[PDB]
Amino acid sequence: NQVPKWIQLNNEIMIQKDGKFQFDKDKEAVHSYFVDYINQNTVFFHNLKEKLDYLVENQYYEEEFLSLYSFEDIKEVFKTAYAKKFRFPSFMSAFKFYNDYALKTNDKKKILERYEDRISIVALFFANGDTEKAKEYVNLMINQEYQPSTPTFLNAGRKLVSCFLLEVNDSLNDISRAIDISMQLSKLGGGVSLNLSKLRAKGEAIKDVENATKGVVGVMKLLDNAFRYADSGAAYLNIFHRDINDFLDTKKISADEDVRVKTLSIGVVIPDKFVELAREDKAAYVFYPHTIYKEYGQHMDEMDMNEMYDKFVDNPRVKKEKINPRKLLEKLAMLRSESGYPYIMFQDNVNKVHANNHISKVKFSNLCSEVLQASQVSSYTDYDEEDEIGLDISCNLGSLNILNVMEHKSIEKTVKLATDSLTHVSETTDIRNAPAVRRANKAMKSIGLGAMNLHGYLAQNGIAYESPEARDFANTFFMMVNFYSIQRSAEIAKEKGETFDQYEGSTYATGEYFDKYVSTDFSPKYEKIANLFEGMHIPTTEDWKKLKAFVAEHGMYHSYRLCIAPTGSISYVQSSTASVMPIMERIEERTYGNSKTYYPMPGLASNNWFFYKEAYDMDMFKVVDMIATIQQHIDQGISFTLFLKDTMTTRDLNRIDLYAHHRGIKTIYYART
Amino acid sequence: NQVPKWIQLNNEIMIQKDGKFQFDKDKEAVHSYFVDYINQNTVFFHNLKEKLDYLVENQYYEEEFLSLYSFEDIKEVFKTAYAKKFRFPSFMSAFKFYNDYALKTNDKKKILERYEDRISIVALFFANGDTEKAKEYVNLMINQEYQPSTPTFLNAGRKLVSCFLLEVNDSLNDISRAIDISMQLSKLGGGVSLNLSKLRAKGEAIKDVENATKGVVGVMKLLDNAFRYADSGAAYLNIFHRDINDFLDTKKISADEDVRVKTLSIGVVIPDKFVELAREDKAAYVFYPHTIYKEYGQHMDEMDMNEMYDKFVDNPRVKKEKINPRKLLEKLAMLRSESGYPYIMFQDNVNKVHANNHISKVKFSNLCSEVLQASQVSSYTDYDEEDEIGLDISCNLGSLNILNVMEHKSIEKTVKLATDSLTHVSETTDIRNAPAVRRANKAMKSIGLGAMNLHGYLAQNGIAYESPEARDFANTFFMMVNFYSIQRSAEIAKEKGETFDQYEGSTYATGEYFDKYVSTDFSPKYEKIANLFEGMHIPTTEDWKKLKAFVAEHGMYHSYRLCIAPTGSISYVQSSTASVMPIMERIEERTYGNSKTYYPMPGLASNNWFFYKEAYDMDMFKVVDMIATIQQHIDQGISFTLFLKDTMTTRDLNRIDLYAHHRGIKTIYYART
Ligand SMILES: Nc1ncnc2c1ncn2[C@H]1C[C@H](O)[C@@H](COP(=O)(O)OP(=O)(O)OP(=O)(O)O)O1
Ligand SMILES: Nc1ncnc2c1ncn2[C@H]1C[C@H](O)[C@@H](COP(=O)(O)OP(=O)(O)OP(=O)(O)O)O1
Ligand SMILES: Nc1ncnc2c1ncn2[C@H]1C[C@H](O)[C@@H](COP(=O)(O)OP(=O)(O)OP(=O)(O)O)O1
Ligand SMILES: Nc1ncnc2c1ncn2[C@H]1C[C@H](O)[C@@H](COP(=O)(O)OP(=O)(O)OP(=O)(O)O)O1
């Protein structure tokens, strides 16, 4: 029943040594725990050969790509990994890896993989034939310069994507098909979310008899019950609906029998017409999209509301409903101050930067609230009858370290290896239930790249998070990685000799995304910011001009390359801080079980004490200015989590919303307290 | 606000005239209501031609089969119907027909069809080309000798079956497919019920990881939520399951959050192994059907429990669960005394008479608890992958009058016309969502025929319902209609030159159903019973021998011909009593709205006062003896509703269950109080 030594060492960290903390007690809490637990619970082997034979015979890996190398090359990459002798600085480093991310035994009572082993296997999977590229993947990974996504780093050749975005058409067979597809993907752990802007409203005529539609809320109840059969999902709605108030009745603070959501996150996508109508404080008009489909031929989200609003107003066919949009703004701010629900997307601001607007307009995002692509709704008829194959969205993940890239300065080769690995993931992944997402991943070849450790690295350098220096740092750095990513995508579309589909209507084929970058040089205007960027060439606008000429020469390979997700589940094993969102506490405190670990921030001392600020005590306006500074280079959206408190008010949240709509911010996340 | 005259006349019926009731006040309550309401709210026409033109142009009928006759032939059958000048004797006769069963206007504020019109249109639909057969259908219908089923008589050529029985396989794609099919048929108003004997138990391994099955109760919760999207359904389970106690937790008298059923009726199908194990008062063993499928290869209901019970006992592979079956009998009787739930089916007793036992064994029935056929479960893979087409059950309805057939004595031609009409219904009906029931209706060509007015007719003749005279009457009469139905089916399979599928393995191809009837002449042993049957030839065993030779000569057309449903919704417009279940009250009293109609039984006077007994004051044992006497001629089951009271006990209900299992009773219905 006795607490072991390393847990007591972690308890000893919080002992006030002259007003500070016993940080080095972590290390023994590392070092004893390696000795007393890790090295005493590992399965013994006599060599590498019998170890690999045990891995083969005990049915733990796909043996094919493992047999794409010799045993000597496998031992070479293993010796290369073990030549690091990686010394974990954090208790949570080993305390999450060998606890969760490491592949253990079948009874899960001993250790199988080491920290080098999983990384080397993932490197062999990413390289898939080459030994030296796998060693480069190791050097990108064993120095923690890159970290792949959670199922990607988890089940590389074992027994894959957490981003899925679909639509729904207005037929019962479509409803059953979508229910089936969500149940198919729910057992695979992928993040599946949708949007319901193409369904008929409550109390409408179902094709023969008047006043027959039970409403969308029954379908939401059905999907909420359907998600109770697996381990989660989400759905959206365009704002100009009569049941949009009922869309606010979903996440009601009085949890009803008739409305009881537990899994489906909601998010209201607001075009500029609604903030236009609420800004003038004039009464607005939502409509019936089935009457719109019966009158004009298309759904309401098929057309822009700013054009066709008065065209719906004067036309007597589509039935009206008149409300106050300012009262809806008040109730939205009220629900956001209650919880932080729902999400808000400025889809016109998304299309204001969207390169593939020639295909469609983005009208929704994921649960991770980051991916913004084009889409097409399908249509499913009966079983004997033939159906349709629309367009879908699937964007893989995987982050890098700002700190390790900025210290090791292999940034272009980092872009090379990360792009090749994400290309390999997009190639290998296949879906055999809904062929629409299969066709979408086959057609778009879309990837998503992000990064972490912004506040911890820059605050570790002695730079405030609320500095314009850090904003210019993000500006120049993401200009450089934008240069390298577009350079790599154009090189890859050259080397393949082939680009993604509908590349010609995008801004890359016309060079319009580079039109911002052929002028307006984002060279660092601050001295410490430039000195951090010293040691490497900063690409100017002429480099962007040659990049534009090379893109117009061949083409670009990925319709999207970048997304930013809250990838906080891997910061501990990356021995690093979170993503570009600033930290909340200098010391995380957890009760693991029968214990209290006290994990401080990595690099926490008294010099960066006030550089490691608190998220409850920051100006959010400088944060969204930084968000816009980063969004100057990101194609898709960024999951900006709002860091708020309980004492704030709804009208200041409204001012934040007007400020973000003024900044052209794409999406927002659930708020803090 | 004043109560109209005919309602006051109906109130005047209950006035005690020398200890009796003012029956003839019904007639003025008929006759004034015809004058003051019916003839004042009908749409005027100048002739028949403009009336039919209005029916065509106002989109009320399928015009094709109406154009399969001349206007003169239509006027001939209309003149034939109007030559009856049918005088309604009951207030509820017109009060349900022109209120509900008649096709009214689009705003439903006037009358379109007359009582002759709907009947004549239905007759033209049944004949479909012939005028004289339609007039014969009129004479069968306008004299109330036959009444078709509710959607059949309702929507004959307008804008169809209430019996659907399916199965479920053990895959998620199968689950989604069945959910889709139930949602497809729910909008069409058909009675859809299933059985869940081929699903894995709660807390079992889902194919890779141990203890992962949430259980069948979540699927039941899902189907209960899914039926909230339309206007009802049911599901069963074989008794030898570990979750069979949880099957009793469904209709729990404490309505839970976690278990809240509102639509799904349950019914436990009990083979002779369970009453064997509960009879000896020995501890029984339910099993895990997924372990059974993994061990022997088949589900548990694939094999007989009486054989394979000890083979499951000695085999250590299938995991056991040991209970007391007598305690389950006690809790079953407790729930039946609480409500009347669930249903009880002796499937071995069903197979003891089942002619198509060469196909499979009957393991379930419908919500109407009457139809017992063979079945095969399907299997549905993914969307791109190929699926299976199993067997299903769909049995049409439609009843006749014992009184009118016994008075008009056209019993063989009644069988002819009813069989041809039910054949036409089975031919015209098609399903375009689940092709399995389409294939099943195409393959079986199965019909269902029943009758009504047993207690009212025989009690109107001066015969007690609890007489063995009435039992011999039902014996001889249903022997005669069995003779005529088998004769008609054999004649029809001769005239088509073609029988139903798998006819050769049935008892009809081997003559074994006639082996009971080539001996044991069911001639009437009572004098008044025979005198009611006098005036027509009673078929002896030699007629059954020639029938057997004619069946072996060609074949029989329908795998099933007979079923008995509680068709009480049409007795009022048939001016008749209920089905073979005896009446409960001599005078039905209803509060229609702002009123109190008092509809007595048809033919209620002081002579048949004690012949019109009360169902709370009868011996149920004579009733189930009558049930077995009728079941001596019926192929399928009969929905015997239990007529019980509150003062009775559970052990007497157990004695009733043992008595019915002793009688070979197929199924039972929900009980009374
Ligand atoms: N931070 C850590 N990261 C990885 N392994 C560790 C860490 N801390 C302790 N250990 C491991 C390595 C050894 O197997 C054991 C402790 O021995 P350790 O002294 O840390 O390594 P070492 O063998 O390279 O140095 P030395 O020769 O001085 O013993 O547990
Ligand atoms: N009985 C019902 N109860 C509730 N919703 C229904 C019912 N029947 C159909 N629906 C729902 C589901 C469908 O998405 C929507 C439209 O009805 P449905 O007949 O299936 O579409 P449709 O493709 O035939 O054309 P339309 O859009 O004109 O109705 O209404
Ligand atoms: N029981 C009923 N069945 C059908 N129609 C009825 C009934 N009772 C009254 N009516 C109808 C028929 C007439 O249109 C009107 C009442 O006239 P009614 O006397 O019953 O018929 P009738 O016209 O054949 O006889 P009469 O020539 O003596 O008036 O309402
Ligand atoms: N994640 C899940 N949660 C709950 N039930 C599931 C889940 N995944 C599958 N199932 C259910 C539905 C299926 O009817 C049943 C069997 O699982 P499933 O993998 O779909 O069948 P299977 O055809 O692949 O073979 P098997 O019967 O061996 O499992 O368990």
Coordinates of all heavy atoms in Angstrom, one line a residue, chain A residues 172-173 176-177 180 183-184 187 214-215 219 221-222 225-226 228-230 257 260 380 382-385 387 432-433 435, chain B residues 172-173 176-177 180 183-184 207 214 219 221-222 225-226 228-231 257 260 382-385 387 432-433 435 438, unseen atoms left out:
Chain A
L172 N -35.3 9.6 -47.0 CA -35.3 8.6 -45.9 C -34.1 7.6 -46.1 O -33.4 7.2 -45.2 CB -36.6 7.9 -45.7 CG -36.7 6.8 -44.7 CD1 -36.3 7.3 -43.3 CD2 -38.0 6.1 -44.7
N173 N -34.0 7.2 -47.4 CA -32.9 6.3 -47.7 C -31.5 6.9 -47.5 O -30.6 6.3 -47.0 CB -33.0 5.8 -49.2
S176 N -31.0 6.7 -43.6 CA -30.6 5.4 -43.2 C -29.1 5.1 -43.6 O -28.3 4.5 -42.9 CB -31.5 4.4 -43.8 OG -31.6 4.6 -45.2
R177 N -28.8 5.6 -44.8 CA -27.4 5.4 -45.3 C -26.4 6.2 -44.5 O -25.3 5.6 -44.1 CB -27.3 5.9 -46.8 CG -26.0 5.6 -47.4 CD -25.8 4.2 -47.6 NE -26.8 3.6 -48.6 CZ -27.0 2.3 -48.7 NH1 -26.3 1.4 -48.0 NH2 -27.9 2.0 -49.6
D180 N -26.0 4.4 -41.2 CA -25.1 3.2 -41.4 C -23.7 3.6 -41.5 O -22.8 3.0 -40.9 CB -25.6 2.5 -42.6 CG -24.5 1.6 -43.2 OD1 -24.3 0.5 -42.5 OD2 -23.9 1.9 -44.2
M183 N -22.3 4.6 -38.1 CA -22.1 3.4 -37.3 C -20.9 2.6 -37.8 O -20.3 1.9 -37.0 CB -23.4 2.6 -37.3 CG -24.4 3.1 -36.4 SD -25.9 2.0 -36.3 CE -26.2 1.9 -38.0
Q184 N -20.6 2.7 -39.1 CA -19.4 2.0 -39.6 C -18.2 2.7 -39.1 O -17.2 2.0 -38.7 CB -19.5 2.0 -41.2 CG -20.4 1.0 -41.8 CD -20.1 -0.4 -41.4 OE1 -18.9 -0.8 -41.3 NE2 -21.1 -1.2 -41.1
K187 N -17.0 2.6 -34.9 CA -16.1 1.5 -34.4 C -14.7 1.7 -34.7 O -13.8 1.0 -34.1 CB -16.6 0.2 -34.9 CG -16.3 -0.1 -36.3 CD -17.0 -1.4 -36.8 CE -16.4 -2.6 -36.2 NZ -17.1 -3.8 -36.6
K214 N -42.0 15.6 -38.6 CA -41.8 15.6 -37.2 C -40.7 16.6 -36.8 O -40.8 17.2 -35.7 CB -41.4 14.2 -36.7 CG -42.6 13.2 -36.8 CD -42.3 12.0 -36.0 CE -43.5 11.1 -35.8 NZ -44.0 10.6 -37.2
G215 N -39.8 16.9 -37.7 CA -38.8 17.9 -37.5 C -37.4 17.3 -37.5 O -37.2 16.0 -37.4
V219 N -34.5 13.6 -35.6 CA -33.3 13.0 -36.3 C -32.1 13.2 -35.4 O -31.3 12.3 -35.3 CB -33.2 13.5 -37.7 CG1 -32.1 12.8 -38.5 CG2 -34.5 13.6 -38.4
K221 N -32.2 13.4 -32.1 CA -32.5 12.4 -31.0 C -32.1 11.0 -31.5 O -31.5 10.3 -30.7 CB -33.9 12.5 -30.6 CG -34.4 11.3 -29.9 CD -33.9 11.3 -28.5 CE -34.3 10.0 -27.8 NZ -34.0 8.8 -28.7
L222 N -32.4 10.7 -32.7 CA -32.0 9.4 -33.3 C -30.5 9.2 -33.4 O -30.0 8.1 -33.1 CB -32.7 9.2 -34.6 CG -34.1 8.7 -34.5 CD1 -34.7 8.5 -35.9 CD2 -34.1 7.4 -33.8
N225 N -29.1 8.8 -29.9 CA -29.3 7.4 -29.5 C -28.4 6.4 -30.2 O -27.9 5.4 -29.6 CB -30.7 7.0 -29.6
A226 N -28.1 6.7 -31.5 CA -27.3 5.8 -32.3 C -25.8 5.8 -31.9 O -25.1 4.8 -32.0 CB -27.4 6.2 -33.8
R228 N -24.8 5.9 -28.9 CA -24.7 5.2 -27.7 C -24.3 3.7 -27.9 O -24.2 3.0 -27.0 CB -26.0 5.2 -26.9 CG -26.5 6.6 -26.7 CD -27.7 6.6 -25.8 NE -28.2 8.0 -25.7 CZ -27.7 8.9 -24.8 NH1 -26.8 8.5 -23.9 NH2 -28.2 10.1 -24.7
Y229 N -24.1 3.3 -29.2 CA -23.7 2.0 -29.5 C -22.2 1.8 -29.6 O -21.7 0.6 -29.7 CB -24.4 1.5 -30.7 CG -24.5 0.0 -30.8 CD1 -24.9 -0.8 -29.6 CD2 -24.2 -0.7 -31.9 CE1 -25.0 -2.1 -29.7 CE2 -24.3 -2.1 -32.0 CZ -24.7 -2.8 -30.8 OH -24.8 -4.2 -30.9
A230 N -21.4 2.9 -29.7 CA -20.0 2.8 -29.8 C -19.3 3.6 -28.8 O -19.9 4.0 -27.8 CB -19.6 3.2 -31.2
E257 N -36.1 15.3 -21.2 CA -36.4 14.0 -21.8 C -36.5 14.1 -23.3 O -35.8 13.3 -24.0 CB -37.7 13.4 -21.3 CG -37.9 11.9 -21.3 CD -38.2 11.3 -22.6 OE1 -38.8 12.1 -23.5 OE2 -37.8 10.2 -22.9
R260 N -32.4 15.4 -25.3 CA -31.2 15.0 -24.4 C -30.1 14.6 -25.3 O -29.9 13.5 -25.8 CB -31.6 13.8 -23.5 CG -30.6 13.5 -22.5 CD -31.1 12.5 -21.5 NE -30.1 12.1 -20.5 CZ -29.3 11.0 -20.6 NH1 -29.4 10.3 -21.7 NH2 -28.4 10.7 -19.7
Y380 N -28.9 8.9 -52.0 CA -29.0 7.5 -51.9 C -30.5 7.2 -52.1 O -31.4 7.6 -51.4 CB -28.5 6.9 -50.6 CG -27.0 7.0 -50.5 CD1 -26.4 8.1 -50.0 CD2 -26.3 5.9 -50.9 CE1 -25.0 8.1 -49.9 CE2 -24.9 5.9 -50.8 CZ -24.3 7.1 -50.3 OH -22.9 7.1 -50.2
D382 N -33.2 3.7 -53.2 CA -33.5 2.4 -52.6 C -32.3 1.4 -53.0 O -31.4 1.7 -53.7 CB -34.8 1.8 -53.1 CG -35.9 2.7 -52.7 OD1 -35.8 3.4 -51.7 OD2 -37.0 2.7 -53.5
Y383 N -32.4 0.2 -52.4 CA -31.4 -0.8 -52.5 C -31.2 -1.3 -53.9 O -30.1 -1.5 -54.4 CB -31.7 -2.0 -51.5 CG -30.7 -3.1 -51.6 CD1 -29.4 -2.9 -51.1 CD2 -31.0 -4.3 -52.2 CE1 -28.5 -3.9 -51.1 CE2 -30.0 -5.3 -52.3 CZ -28.8 -5.1 -51.7 OH -27.9 -6.2 -51.8
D384 N -32.3 -1.7 -54.5 CA -32.3 -2.1 -55.9 C -32.0 -0.9 -56.9 O -31.5 -1.1 -58.0 CB -33.6 -2.7 -56.3 CG -34.8 -2.0 -55.7 OD1 -34.6 -1.0 -55.0 OD2 -36.0 -2.4 -56.0
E385 N -32.3 0.3 -56.4 CA -32.1 1.5 -57.3 C -30.7 2.0 -57.1 O -29.9 1.6 -56.2 CB -33.1 2.5 -56.9 CG -34.5 2.1 -56.8 CD -35.5 3.1 -56.3 OE1 -35.0 4.0 -55.6 OE2 -36.7 3.0 -56.6
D387 N -27.6 4.9 -56.7 CA -27.4 6.0 -55.8 C -26.3 7.0 -56.4 O -25.9 6.8 -57.6 CB -26.9 5.5 -54.4 CG -27.9 4.6 -53.8 OD1 -29.1 4.7 -54.1 OD2 -27.5 3.7 -53.0
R432 N -13.9 1.2 -47.0 CA -14.7 0.3 -47.8 C -16.1 0.2 -47.4 O -16.8 -0.8 -47.7 CB -14.0 -1.1 -47.6 CG -12.7 -1.2 -48.2 CD -12.0 -2.5 -47.8 NE -12.6 -3.7 -48.3 CZ -13.4 -4.5 -47.6 NH1 -13.5 -4.3 -46.3 NH2 -13.9 -5.6 -48.2
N433 N -16.7 1.3 -46.8 CA -18.1 1.3 -46.5 C -18.8 2.4 -47.2 O -19.7 2.2 -48.0 CB -18.3 1.5 -45.0 CG -18.0 0.3 -44.2 OD1 -17.0 0.3 -43.5 ND2 -18.8 -0.7 -44.3
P435 N -18.1 4.9 -50.2 CA -17.1 5.1 -51.2 C -16.9 6.6 -51.5 O -16.0 7.0 -52.3 CB -17.7 4.4 -52.4 CG -19.1 4.4 -52.2 CD -19.3 4.3 -50.7
Chain B
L172 N -23.5 -5.7 -37.9 CA -23.9 -4.3 -37.7 C -24.6 -3.8 -39.0 O -25.6 -3.0 -38.9 CB -22.7 -3.4 -37.4 CG -23.0 -1.9 -37.4 CD1 -24.0 -1.5 -36.3 CD2 -21.7 -1.1 -37.1
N173 N -24.1 -4.2 -40.2 CA -24.8 -3.9 -41.4 C -26.2 -4.5 -41.5 O -27.1 -3.8 -42.0 CB -23.9 -4.4 -42.6
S176 N -28.4 -2.1 -39.3 CA -28.7 -0.9 -40.0 C -29.7 -1.2 -41.2 O -30.7 -0.4 -41.4 CB -27.5 -0.3 -40.6 OG -26.8 -1.2 -41.3
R177 N -29.6 -2.3 -41.8 CA -30.5 -2.7 -42.9 C -31.9 -2.9 -42.4 O -32.9 -2.5 -43.0 CB -30.0 -3.9 -43.6 CG -30.8 -4.3 -44.8 CD -30.6 -3.3 -45.9 NE -29.2 -3.3 -46.4 CZ -28.7 -2.3 -47.1 NH1 -29.5 -1.3 -47.5 NH2 -27.5 -2.4 -47.5
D180 N -33.5 0.3 -41.4 CA -33.9 1.0 -42.6 C -35.2 0.4 -43.2 O -36.1 1.1 -43.6 CB -32.8 0.9 -43.7 CG -33.4 1.2 -45.1 OD1 -33.7 2.3 -45.4 OD2 -33.5 0.2 -45.8
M183 N -38.1 1.3 -41.0 CA -38.5 2.7 -41.3 C -39.2 2.9 -42.6 O -40.0 3.8 -42.8 CB -37.3 3.6 -41.2 CG -36.9 3.9 -39.7 SD -35.5 5.1 -39.7 CE -34.3 4.2 -40.7
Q184 N -38.8 2.0 -43.6 CA -39.5 2.0 -44.9 C -41.0 1.6 -44.8 O -41.9 2.2 -45.3 CB -38.8 1.1 -45.9 CG -37.5 1.7 -46.4 CD -37.8 3.0 -47.1 OE1 -38.7 3.2 -47.9 NE2 -36.9 4.0 -46.9
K207 N -15.7 -10.0 -31.4 CA -14.8 -10.5 -32.5 C -13.3 -10.3 -32.3 O -12.5 -10.9 -32.9 CB -15.3 -9.9 -33.8 CG -14.9 -10.7 -35.1 CD -15.4 -10.0 -36.3 CE -15.1 -8.6 -36.4 NZ -16.0 -7.8 -37.3
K214 N -22.7 -4.4 -25.7 CA -23.5 -3.6 -24.8 C -24.8 -4.4 -24.5 O -25.4 -4.2 -23.4 CB -23.8 -2.3 -25.4 CG -22.6 -1.4 -25.6 CD -23.1 0.0 -25.9 CE -21.9 1.0 -25.7 NZ -20.8 0.7 -26.6
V219 N -30.2 -2.3 -28.4 CA -30.8 -2.4 -29.7 C -32.3 -2.2 -29.6 O -33.0 -1.6 -30.5 CB -30.4 -3.7 -30.4 CG1 -30.8 -3.7 -31.9 CG2 -28.9 -3.9 -30.2
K221 N -33.8 -0.5 -27.2 CA -33.9 1.0 -27.0 C -33.9 1.8 -28.3 O -34.6 2.7 -28.5 CB -32.9 1.4 -26.0 CG -32.6 2.9 -25.9 CD -33.7 3.6 -25.3 CE -33.5 5.1 -25.4 NZ -33.1 5.5 -26.8
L222 N -33.0 1.3 -29.2 CA -32.8 2.0 -30.5 C -34.0 1.8 -31.3 O -34.4 2.8 -32.0 CB -31.5 1.5 -31.2 CG -30.3 2.2 -30.7 CD1 -29.1 1.6 -31.4 CD2 -30.4 3.7 -31.0
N225 N -36.8 4.0 -30.0 CA -36.6 5.4 -30.4 C -36.9 5.6 -31.9 O -37.4 6.6 -32.3 CB -35.2 5.8 -30.1
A226 N -36.6 4.5 -32.7 CA -36.8 4.6 -34.1 C -38.2 4.6 -34.5 O -38.6 5.2 -35.5 CB -36.0 3.5 -34.8
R228 N -40.5 6.1 -33.0 CA -41.0 7.4 -32.7 C -41.0 8.4 -33.8 O -41.4 9.5 -33.7 CB -40.3 8.0 -31.5 CG -40.2 7.2 -30.3 CD -39.6 7.9 -29.2 NE -39.4 7.0 -28.0 CZ -40.4 6.7 -27.1 NH1 -41.6 7.3 -27.3 NH2 -40.2 5.9 -26.1
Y229 N -40.6 7.9 -35.0 CA -40.5 8.8 -36.2 C -41.7 8.6 -37.1 O -41.9 9.4 -38.0 CB -39.2 8.6 -36.9 CG -38.9 9.7 -37.8 CD1 -38.9 11.0 -37.3 CD2 -38.5 9.5 -39.1 CE1 -38.6 12.1 -38.1 CE2 -38.1 10.6 -39.9 CZ -38.2 11.9 -39.4 OH -37.9 13.0 -40.2
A230 N -42.5 7.5 -36.9 CA -43.7 7.3 -37.7 C -45.0 7.2 -36.8 O -44.9 7.5 -35.6 CB -43.5 6.1 -38.6
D231 N -46.1 6.7 -37.4 CA -47.3 6.6 -36.7 C -47.3 5.5 -35.7 O -48.3 4.8 -35.5 CB -48.5 6.3 -37.8 CG -48.5 7.3 -38.9 OD1 -48.0 8.4 -38.7 OD2 -49.0 6.9 -40.0
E257 N -35.8 5.1 -17.1 CA -35.1 5.8 -18.1 C -34.4 4.8 -19.1 O -34.5 4.9 -20.3 CB -34.1 6.8 -17.5 CG -33.7 8.0 -18.2 CD -32.7 7.7 -19.4 OE1 -31.9 6.8 -19.2 OE2 -32.8 8.4 -20.4
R260 N -37.3 2.0 -21.5 CA -38.5 2.6 -21.7 C -39.1 2.2 -23.1 O -38.8 2.8 -24.1 CB -38.4 4.2 -21.6 CG -39.8 4.9 -21.6 CD -39.6 6.3 -21.3 NE -40.9 7.1 -21.3 CZ -41.3 7.7 -22.4 NH1 -40.6 7.7 -23.5 NH2 -42.5 8.3 -22.4
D382 N -21.5 -5.0 -46.4 CA -21.3 -3.6 -46.7 C -22.0 -3.2 -48.0 O -22.5 -4.0 -48.8 CB -19.8 -3.2 -46.7 CG -19.2 -3.5 -45.4 OD1 -19.8 -3.4 -44.4 OD2 -17.9 -3.7 -45.4
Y383 N -21.9 -1.9 -48.3 CA -22.7 -1.3 -49.4 C -22.0 -1.7 -50.7 O -22.7 -2.1 -51.7 CB -22.7 0.2 -49.3 CG -23.3 0.9 -50.5 CD1 -24.7 0.9 -50.7 CD2 -22.6 1.6 -51.5 CE1 -25.3 1.5 -51.7 CE2 -23.2 2.2 -52.5 CZ -24.5 2.2 -52.7 OH -25.2 2.8 -53.7
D384 N -20.7 -1.7 -50.8 CA -20.0 -2.1 -52.0 C -20.1 -3.7 -52.1 O -20.0 -4.2 -53.2 CB -18.6 -1.6 -52.0 CG -18.0 -1.7 -50.6 OD1 -18.7 -2.1 -49.7 OD2 -16.8 -1.3 -50.5
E385 N -20.2 -4.3 -51.0 CA -20.2 -5.8 -50.9 C -21.6 -6.3 -51.2 O -22.6 -5.6 -51.1 CB -19.7 -6.3 -49.6 CG -18.4 -5.6 -49.1 CD -18.0 -6.0 -47.7 OE1 -18.9 -6.4 -46.9 OE2 -16.8 -5.9 -47.4
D387 N -24.9 -8.9 -50.6 CA -25.7 -9.3 -49.5 C -26.5 -10.6 -49.8 O -26.3 -11.2 -50.9 CB -26.7 -8.2 -49.1 CG -26.0 -6.9 -48.8 OD1 -24.8 -7.0 -48.4 OD2 -26.6 -5.8 -48.9
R432 N -40.7 -2.5 -52.8 CA -39.6 -2.1 -53.5 C -38.4 -1.6 -52.6 O -37.5 -0.9 -53.1 CB -39.9 -1.0 -54.5 CG -40.8 -1.5 -55.6 CD -41.4 -0.4 -56.4 NE -40.4 0.4 -57.2 CZ -40.0 1.6 -56.8 NH1 -40.5 2.2 -55.8 NH2 -39.0 2.2 -57.5
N433 N -38.4 -2.0 -51.3 CA -37.3 -1.6 -50.4 C -36.6 -2.9 -49.9 O -35.4 -2.9 -50.2 CB -37.9 -0.9 -49.2 CG -38.4 0.5 -49.6 OD1 -39.6 0.8 -49.6 ND2 -37.4 1.4 -49.9
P435 N -36.2 -6.6 -50.8 CA -36.6 -7.6 -51.8 C -36.9 -9.0 -51.2 O -37.4 -9.9 -51.9 CB -35.4 -7.6 -52.8 CG -34.3 -7.2 -51.9 CD -34.8 -6.3 -50.9
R438 N -40.5 -9.3 -50.8 CA -41.0 -9.4 -52.2 C -40.9 -10.8 -52.8 O -41.8 -11.4 -53.3 CB -40.2 -8.4 -53.1 CG -40.6 -8.3 -54.5 CD -39.8 -7.3 -55.2 NE -40.2 -7.0 -56.6 CZ -39.6 -6.1 -57.3 NH1 -38.7 -5.3 -56.9 NH2 -40.0 -5.9 -58.6

